[PDB]
Coordinates of C-alpha atoms and ligand atoms in Angstrom, one line a residue:
Chain A
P1 CA 16.5 0.9 22.2
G2 CA 13.9 0.6 19.1
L3 CA 12.8 -2.7 16.9
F4 CA 13.8 -2.8 12.8
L5 CA 11.3 -4.8 10.8
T6 CA 10.9 -5.2 7.1
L7 CA 8.7 -6.9 4.7
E8 CA 9.6 -7.5 1.4
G9 CA 7.7 -9.7 -1.6
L10 CA 6.0 -9.1 -5.3
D11 CA 3.7 -6.5 -5.7
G12 CA 0.2 -8.1 -3.8
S13 CA 1.7 -10.2 -2.0
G14 CA 0.1 -8.7 0.8
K15 CA 3.3 -6.8 2.4
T16 CA 0.9 -3.7 3.7
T17 CA -1.8 -6.1 4.9
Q18 CA 0.8 -7.7 6.9
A19 CA 2.2 -4.4 7.9
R20 CA -0.9 -2.8 9.0
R21 CA -1.7 -6.4 11.1
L22 CA 1.9 -6.1 12.7
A23 CA 1.4 -3.0 13.9
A24 CA -2.5 -3.6 15.2
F25 CA -0.5 -6.3 16.7
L26 CA 2.5 -4.0 18.7
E27 CA -0.3 -1.7 19.4
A28 CA -2.6 -4.2 21.4
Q29 CA 0.8 -4.9 23.7
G30 CA 1.3 -1.3 24.4
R31 CA 4.4 -1.3 22.3
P32 CA 5.4 2.1 20.3
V33 CA 5.5 1.7 16.5
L34 CA 5.8 3.6 13.6
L35 CA 4.7 2.7 10.2
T36 CA 6.6 3.7 6.7
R37 CA 7.1 2.7 3.4
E38 CA 9.5 3.5 -0.1
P39 CA 9.9 4.2 -2.1
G40 CA 8.5 7.6 -0.9
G41 CA 9.0 7.6 2.7
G42 CA 11.9 10.1 2.3
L43 CA 11.2 11.7 -0.9
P44 CA 7.7 11.8 -2.0
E45 CA 8.8 13.2 -5.3
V46 CA 10.7 10.3 -6.1
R47 CA 7.7 8.0 -5.8
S48 CA 5.5 10.1 -8.1
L49 CA 8.1 11.0 -10.8
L50 CA 9.2 6.9 -11.2
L51 CA 5.4 6.5 -11.6
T52 CA 5.3 7.7 -14.9
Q53 CA 8.2 7.3 -16.5
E54 CA 10.9 4.9 -17.0
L55 CA 14.5 5.5 -16.5
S56 CA 17.8 3.1 -17.0
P57 CA 18.5 0.7 -13.9
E58 CA 21.0 2.2 -13.1
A59 CA 19.2 6.2 -13.1
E60 CA 16.1 4.4 -11.3
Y61 CA 18.5 2.5 -7.9
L62 CA 20.1 6.0 -7.8
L63 CA 16.5 7.5 -7.4
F64 CA 15.5 4.9 -4.8
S65 CA 18.9 5.2 -3.3
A66 CA 18.7 8.7 -2.6
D67 CA 14.8 8.4 -1.3
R68 CA 16.2 5.8 0.7
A69 CA 19.2 8.2 2.4
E70 CA 16.1 10.5 3.7
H71 CA 14.2 7.7 4.9
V72 CA 16.5 6.7 7.1
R73 CA 17.5 9.6 8.5
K74 CA 14.4 11.6 8.3
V75 CA 11.8 8.7 9.4
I76 CA 13.6 5.3 10.5
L77 CA 16.8 6.1 13.0
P78 CA 14.7 8.8 14.6
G79 CA 11.8 6.7 15.0
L80 CA 14.4 4.2 16.6
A81 CA 15.8 6.0 18.6
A82 CA 12.5 7.1 20.4
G83 CA 12.2 3.3 21.0
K84 CA 9.9 2.7 18.7
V85 CA 9.1 -0.3 16.5
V86 CA 9.8 0.6 13.0
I87 CA 8.1 -1.2 10.3
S88 CA 9.4 -0.4 7.0
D89 CA 7.2 -2.1 3.9
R90 CA 10.2 -2.5 1.0
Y91 CA 14.1 -1.7 2.1
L92 CA 17.0 -2.4 0.5
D93 CA 16.0 -6.0 -0.3
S94 CA 13.8 -4.6 -2.8
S95 CA 16.5 -2.7 -5.3
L96 CA 18.7 -5.8 -4.4
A97 CA 15.4 -8.3 -6.0
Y98 CA 14.5 -5.9 -8.6
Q99 CA 17.2 -3.4 -10.2
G100 CA 19.8 -6.3 -9.0
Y101 CA 18.3 -9.9 -9.6
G102 CA 15.6 -8.6 -12.2
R103 CA 17.1 -5.9 -14.5
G104 CA 20.8 -7.2 -13.9
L105 CA 23.1 -4.4 -12.1
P106 CA 25.2 -5.9 -10.1
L107 CA 24.8 -6.8 -6.5
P108 CA 28.3 -6.1 -4.9
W109 CA 28.0 -2.2 -6.6
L110 CA 24.7 -2.1 -5.3
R111 CA 26.2 -2.5 -1.5
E112 CA 28.7 -0.1 -1.7
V113 CA 26.4 2.4 -3.0
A114 CA 23.8 1.5 -0.2
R115 CA 26.3 1.6 3.0
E116 CA 26.5 5.3 2.8
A117 CA 22.5 5.8 1.9
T118 CA 21.7 3.6 5.0
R119 CA 24.5 3.6 7.3
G120 CA 24.6 0.1 7.4
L121 CA 21.0 0.2 9.0
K122 CA 19.7 -3.8 8.6
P123 CA 16.6 -4.6 10.0
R124 CA 16.8 -7.3 13.0
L125 CA 13.7 -9.6 10.8
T126 CA 12.8 -9.3 7.2
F127 CA 9.9 -11.0 6.3
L128 CA 9.5 -12.2 2.5
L129 CA 5.9 -12.9 1.1
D130 CA 6.7 -15.5 -1.2
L131 CA 4.5 -16.1 -4.4
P132 CA 5.0 -16.9 -7.9
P133 CA 3.3 -13.6 -10.0
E134 CA 0.9 -15.3 -11.3
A135 CA -0.4 -15.8 -7.9
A136 CA 0.1 -11.8 -6.8
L137 CA -3.4 -10.6 -5.7
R138 CA -2.7 -6.9 -6.6
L139 CA 8.8 -6.7 -18.8
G140 CA 7.2 -9.9 -19.9
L141 CA 6.6 -12.6 -16.6
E142 CA 10.3 -13.7 -16.7
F143 CA 11.3 -9.8 -15.6
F144 CA 9.0 -11.3 -12.9
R145 CA 10.2 -14.1 -12.1
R146 CA 13.7 -13.3 -11.5
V147 CA 12.6 -11.2 -9.0
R148 CA 11.0 -13.6 -7.3
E149 CA 13.8 -16.1 -7.6
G150 CA 16.4 -13.1 -6.3
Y151 CA 14.2 -12.8 -3.5
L152 CA 14.1 -16.0 -2.4
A153 CA 18.3 -16.3 -3.3
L154 CA 18.6 -13.2 -0.7
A155 CA 16.5 -15.4 2.0
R156 CA 19.0 -18.2 1.7
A157 CA 21.9 -16.2 2.0
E158 CA 20.7 -14.9 5.3
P159 CA 18.4 -17.3 7.1
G160 CA 18.8 -15.7 10.3
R161 CA 17.2 -12.1 8.9
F162 CA 14.6 -13.2 6.2
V163 CA 11.7 -15.5 7.7
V164 CA 10.1 -16.9 4.4
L165 CA 6.2 -16.9 4.5
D166 CA 4.0 -18.7 2.0
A167 CA 2.1 -15.4 0.9
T168 CA -1.2 -17.6 -0.6
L169 CA -2.0 -18.4 3.0
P170 CA -4.9 -16.8 4.8
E171 CA -3.9 -13.5 6.2
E172 CA -4.9 -14.3 9.8
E173 CA -2.7 -17.9 9.7
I174 CA 0.7 -15.7 8.0
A175 CA 0.0 -12.9 10.7
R176 CA 0.2 -15.8 12.9
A177 CA 3.2 -17.1 11.8
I178 CA 5.2 -13.5 12.0
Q179 CA 3.9 -13.0 15.3
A180 CA 5.5 -16.5 16.3
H181 CA 9.1 -15.9 14.9
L182 CA 8.7 -12.3 16.2
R183 CA 8.0 -13.1 20.0
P184 CA 11.0 -14.0 21.1
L185 CA 12.2 -10.4 20.2
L186 CA 10.2 -8.6 23.1
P187 CA 9.4 -9.5 26.7
Chain B
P1 CA 34.8 8.8 -32.5
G2 CA 33.4 11.5 -31.0
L3 CA 35.4 14.2 -28.6
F4 CA 34.1 14.9 -24.6
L5 CA 34.8 18.4 -23.2
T6 CA 34.0 19.6 -20.2
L7 CA 33.2 23.2 -18.4
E8 CA 33.6 23.6 -14.7
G9 CA 34.4 26.1 -12.1
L10 CA 32.1 27.5 -9.0
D11 CA 28.7 29.5 -9.5
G12 CA 29.4 32.3 -11.2
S13 CA 32.6 31.4 -13.1
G14 CA 32.0 32.2 -16.5
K15 CA 30.6 28.1 -17.5
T16 CA 28.0 29.1 -19.2
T17 CA 29.1 31.7 -21.1
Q18 CA 32.4 29.6 -21.7
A19 CA 30.5 26.3 -23.0
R20 CA 27.9 28.4 -25.5
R21 CA 30.9 30.6 -27.2
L22 CA 32.8 27.2 -27.8
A23 CA 30.5 25.3 -29.2
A24 CA 29.3 28.4 -31.6
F25 CA 33.2 28.3 -32.2
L26 CA 33.1 24.5 -33.1
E27 CA 29.8 24.9 -35.0
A28 CA 31.4 28.1 -37.3
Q29 CA 34.4 25.5 -38.0
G30 CA 32.1 22.6 -39.4
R31 CA 32.3 20.6 -36.6
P32 CA 29.1 18.9 -35.0
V33 CA 28.3 20.1 -31.4
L34 CA 26.0 18.5 -29.1
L35 CA 26.2 21.0 -26.5
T36 CA 24.6 19.7 -23.2
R37 CA 24.4 20.0 -19.3
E38 CA 23.9 18.9 -15.4
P39 CA 22.0 19.1 -13.6
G40 CA 19.1 18.0 -16.1
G41 CA 20.7 16.7 -19.1
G42 CA 19.9 13.0 -18.7
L43 CA 16.9 13.8 -16.1
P44 CA 15.4 17.0 -16.1
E45 CA 12.9 16.6 -13.1
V46 CA 16.2 16.1 -10.7
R47 CA 16.6 20.2 -10.4
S48 CA 13.1 19.8 -8.9
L49 CA 14.3 17.1 -6.6
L50 CA 17.6 18.7 -5.9
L51 CA 15.5 22.0 -4.7
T52 CA 14.4 19.8 -1.3
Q53 CA 14.6 21.4 2.0
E54 CA 16.9 20.1 4.7
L55 CA 18.5 17.4 1.9
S56 CA 20.6 15.1 3.4
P57 CA 24.5 15.0 1.4
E58 CA 24.2 11.5 0.1
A59 CA 21.2 11.9 -1.1
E60 CA 22.0 15.2 -3.0
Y61 CA 25.1 13.4 -4.7
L62 CA 22.5 10.2 -5.4
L63 CA 20.0 12.3 -7.2
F64 CA 22.6 14.1 -9.0
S65 CA 24.1 10.6 -10.0
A66 CA 21.0 9.2 -10.9
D67 CA 21.1 12.6 -13.2
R68 CA 24.5 11.4 -14.5
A69 CA 23.6 7.6 -15.2
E70 CA 21.0 9.2 -17.7
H71 CA 22.6 11.9 -19.4
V72 CA 25.6 9.4 -19.7
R73 CA 23.7 6.7 -21.7
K74 CA 20.4 8.6 -23.5
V75 CA 23.0 11.7 -24.7
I76 CA 26.8 12.0 -24.0
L77 CA 27.3 8.0 -25.6
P78 CA 25.3 8.5 -28.1
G79 CA 26.4 12.2 -29.6
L80 CA 30.2 10.7 -29.3
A81 CA 29.4 7.4 -31.0
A82 CA 27.8 9.5 -33.9
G83 CA 31.3 11.9 -34.4
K84 CA 30.2 14.5 -32.4
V85 CA 32.4 16.9 -30.0
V86 CA 30.1 17.0 -26.6
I87 CA 30.7 19.6 -24.1
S88 CA 28.9 19.2 -21.1
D89 CA 28.5 22.5 -18.5
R90 CA 29.3 20.3 -15.7
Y91 CA 30.0 16.9 -14.7
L92 CA 31.5 14.6 -12.7
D93 CA 34.1 17.1 -10.7
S94 CA 31.1 19.2 -9.8
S95 CA 30.1 16.5 -7.8
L96 CA 33.4 15.8 -6.2
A97 CA 34.3 19.5 -5.5
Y98 CA 31.1 20.1 -4.3
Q99 CA 29.8 17.4 -2.8
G100 CA 33.1 16.0 -1.6
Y101 CA 35.2 18.6 -0.9
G102 CA 32.2 20.9 -0.1
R103 CA 29.9 18.6 1.9
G104 CA 32.2 16.1 3.5
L105 CA 31.1 12.7 1.7
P106 CA 34.2 10.2 0.8
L107 CA 35.8 11.0 -2.6
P108 CA 36.6 6.4 -2.3
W109 CA 32.4 6.4 -2.6
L110 CA 31.8 9.3 -4.7
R111 CA 34.3 7.4 -7.4
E112 CA 32.8 4.4 -6.3
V113 CA 29.0 5.3 -7.7
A114 CA 30.8 7.3 -10.3
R115 CA 32.2 3.9 -12.0
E116 CA 28.8 2.2 -13.0
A117 CA 26.8 6.0 -13.1
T118 CA 29.4 7.0 -16.1
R119 CA 30.7 3.5 -17.4
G120 CA 34.0 5.3 -16.5
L121 CA 33.7 7.7 -19.4
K122 CA 35.8 10.7 -18.4
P123 CA 36.0 13.9 -20.5
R124 CA 39.7 14.5 -22.8
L125 CA 39.9 17.8 -21.3
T126 CA 38.3 20.1 -19.0
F127 CA 38.4 23.7 -18.3
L128 CA 38.0 24.9 -15.2
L129 CA 37.4 28.7 -14.8
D130 CA 39.2 28.9 -11.5
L131 CA 37.2 32.2 -9.5
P132 CA 37.9 33.6 -6.0
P133 CA 35.2 32.0 -3.8
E134 CA 33.6 35.2 -2.4
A135 CA 32.9 36.5 -6.1
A136 CA 30.5 33.1 -6.1
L137 CA 26.4 33.5 -5.8
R138 CA 19.7 26.9 -5.9
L139 CA 21.4 24.3 -3.1
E140 CA 21.1 23.9 0.4
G141 CA 23.6 26.5 3.1
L142 CA 25.7 27.7 0.0
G143 CA 27.6 29.6 2.3
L144 CA 31.3 31.7 1.8
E145 CA 32.7 28.6 3.7
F146 CA 31.8 26.1 1.7
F147 CA 32.9 27.8 -1.6
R148 CA 36.8 28.1 0.4
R149 CA 36.3 24.3 0.2
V150 CA 34.8 23.6 -2.8
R151 CA 37.4 26.3 -4.7
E152 CA 40.4 24.6 -3.4
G153 CA 38.5 21.0 -4.3
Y154 CA 38.4 21.9 -7.7
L155 CA 42.2 23.1 -7.6
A156 CA 43.4 19.9 -6.0
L157 CA 41.0 18.0 -8.7
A158 CA 43.1 19.6 -11.0
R159 CA 47.0 19.2 -9.6
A160 CA 45.9 15.4 -9.4
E161 CA 45.0 15.1 -13.4
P162 CA 47.1 17.8 -14.8
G163 CA 46.9 16.4 -18.2
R164 CA 43.1 16.7 -18.6
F165 CA 42.7 19.8 -16.5
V166 CA 43.7 23.8 -18.2
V167 CA 43.4 26.0 -15.2
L168 CA 42.0 29.7 -15.9
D169 CA 41.6 32.4 -14.7
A170 CA 37.7 33.2 -14.6
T171 CA 38.5 37.1 -13.6
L172 CA 40.3 37.2 -17.2
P173 CA 38.1 39.1 -19.9
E174 CA 35.6 36.6 -21.8
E175 CA 37.2 36.7 -24.9
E176 CA 41.1 36.3 -23.8
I177 CA 39.3 32.9 -21.5
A178 CA 37.9 31.6 -25.3
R179 CA 40.9 32.4 -27.3
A180 CA 42.5 30.6 -24.4
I181 CA 40.4 27.4 -24.4
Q182 CA 40.3 27.6 -28.3
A183 CA 44.2 27.4 -28.3
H184 CA 44.4 24.3 -25.9
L185 CA 41.7 22.3 -28.5
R186 CA 43.8 23.1 -31.6
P187 CA 46.0 19.9 -31.3
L188 CA 42.9 17.8 -30.6
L189 CA 40.7 19.1 -33.4
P190 CA 42.2 18.4 -37.0
Ligands
ADP1 N1 35.0 36.7 -17.6 C1 33.9 38.1 -17.2 N2 34.5 38.8 -16.3 C2 33.2 39.6 -15.6 N3 31.5 38.6 -15.4 C3 31.5 37.8 -16.7 C4 32.8 36.6 -17.2 N4 32.6 35.8 -17.6 C5 31.2 35.8 -17.6 N5 30.5 37.2 -16.7 C6 29.1 37.4 -16.6 O1 28.5 36.9 -14.8 C7 28.0 36.3 -14.6 C8 28.4 34.5 -14.1 O2 28.5 34.2 -15.6 P1 28.0 32.6 -16.0 O3 28.2 31.8 -17.5 O4 26.3 32.4 -15.7 O5 28.4 31.9 -14.7 P2 28.8 30.0 -14.6 O6 28.1 29.7 -15.8 O7 29.9 29.4 -14.3 O8 27.4 30.1 -13.2 C9 26.9 36.4 -16.1 O9 25.7 37.7 -15.6 C10 28.2 36.9 -16.4 O10 27.6 37.7 -17.9
TYD2 C1 26.3 18.8 -11.7 C2 26.3 19.8 -10.4 C3 26.4 20.4 -9.8 N1 26.0 20.8 -8.4 C4 25.2 21.9 -8.6 C5 26.3 23.6 -8.6 C6 25.1 24.7 -8.6 O1 25.0 25.3 -7.4 C7 24.0 23.7 -8.7 C8 23.3 23.6 -9.9 O2 24.8 23.8 -11.1 P1 24.3 24.7 -12.3 O3 22.9 23.9 -13.3 O4 25.1 24.2 -13.7 O5 24.0 26.2 -11.5 P2 22.5 26.9 -12.1 O6 21.7 26.3 -11.3 O7 22.8 28.7 -11.5 O8 22.5 27.0 -14.0 O9 24.5 22.4 -8.5 C9 26.7 20.2 -7.4 O10 26.2 20.3 -6.3 N2 26.8 18.9 -7.5 C10 27.0 18.8 -9.1 O11 27.5 17.2 -9.6
TMP3 C1 12.0 0.0 -2.9 C2 11.8 0.1 -4.5 C3 10.7 0.1 -4.8 N1 10.4 -0.3 -6.3 C4 9.5 -1.1 -6.8 C5 8.9 -2.3 -7.4 C6 7.7 -2.7 -7.1 O1 6.7 -2.2 -8.1 C7 7.2 -0.9 -7.1 C8 6.0 -0.8 -5.1 O2 5.6 1.0 -5.7 P1 4.2 1.1 -4.9 O3 4.2 0.1 -3.5 O4 4.4 2.6 -4.6 O5 3.4 0.0 -5.7 O6 8.5 -0.1 -6.6 C9 11.8 -1.3 -6.5 O7 12.3 -1.3 -8.2 N2 13.1 -0.9 -5.9 C10 12.9 -0.6 -4.8 O8 14.1 -0.2 -4.3
CL4 CL1 16.7 -3.3 15.6
CL5 CL1 1.7 -5.5 -1.4
CL6 CL1 19.4 -4.7 4.5
CL7 CL1 45.9 14.0 -16.5
MG8 MG1 13.3 4.0 -2.5
MG9 MG1 20.4 2.2 -1.6
MG10 MG1 20.8 -11.7 1.5
MG11 MG1 25.6 28.3 -15.2
MG12 MG1 34.1 17.6 -15.7
MG13 MG1 28.2 10.1 -9.6
MG14 MG1 44.3 23.0 -3.5
MG15 MG1 41.3 15.0 -9.9

């Protein structure tokens, strides 16, 4: 049982907001829900360490992946075995967009690292809240362009898992679109 | 330029003792030496991270690897580039023996993670201080059964790369181990 969903986008694309509203929507239908996030959900100390320190991309990816590995094991997989709808604000796609397309690390290596860290757990549906970095409500601009395009490139590679939402629209109608796509996967 | 050396073995095998003796022995010969270690040489804060309760073996290895990636880029390669003899107390082999043979993680995955973590950098010589498992004395569930697997793992890694590894008997007195290490170095120096 259980359903695994993720949200992705740049910081200030409104992921937490939509994660909050999606939880509330599923609670209103009586469906058990669990919110969680990366970084921090597996190893909170990773999150606080990366906050005040910049490393090499390789080193920083491996920390994200250790956190992810604990996150998948202690939080996400248990939640799904209990029949809950688990919603993660950021997951693997964040590393692929930021460390891969942004900092330039090779994608095939990242996914081979990720495969054991995640046990190959992929979300059923990932919502990409897309906007230009200048429109975001919260290493130059060029880095943030690369991450956004990277997200869009990931989405067009897997059109079955990504749902690309224009994040500049009002939050209420963005919420209804997410609800629309999600409807078929519940009764 | 430069020479990359490492010390390996179980907890309590004399690695730290012998790396420090070696460093000092090379400095007295007038050679530039960089003494380093793992975990912590790349990312000091990883030792905090590694103590986390009930840490899965995958996260464990990825933590060691985060540190290793930073350690290679910021400390080891720039030291080697300047012609220093760089000695690391523990390197990739620790992960292969502890997280591979000890925890049961697949070696090919470990090595695939290692490729980009180390950028292919392997030491010229690695001194394995082979210690009996019962003599070994932080990390989760460091039991006797674990140490047998780790010890035998080290010995299998030695057999697979017998030109890189020099296996020495860790129960021998410290002067004799150091002299034996020094003798395996002599052709690689002047
Ligand atoms: N050849 C030896 N014989 C007996 N004891 C030793 C020998 N070498 C080191 N020791 C002692 O064993 C302990 C562990 O040594 P250490 O160098 O810290 O091991 P490691 O670095 O491998 O953990 C220390 O108290 C040290 O004095
Ligand atoms: C470098 C490394 C260490 N370890 C383990 C060995 C030790 O039990 C622990 C710390 O090593 P070390 O710092 O050498 O021992 P000490 O803490 O006594 O100074 O980490 C691994 O499991 N994998 C690794 O890749
Ligand atoms: C989960 C994850 C986050 N990040 C970064 C991108 C964001 O700027 C930042 C978000 O942290 P925050 O949500 O605590 O603000 O973390 C990555 O670079 N890779 C990842 O895999
Ligand atoms: Cl699912
Ligand atoms: Cl957000
Ligand atoms: Cl995924
Ligand atoms: Cl060899
Ligand atoms: Mg993470
Ligand atoms: Mg990962
Ligand atoms: Mg894709
Ligand atoms: Mg030591
Ligand atoms: Mg080594
Ligand atoms: Mg490694
Ligand atoms: Mg053997
Ligand atoms: Mg070997």
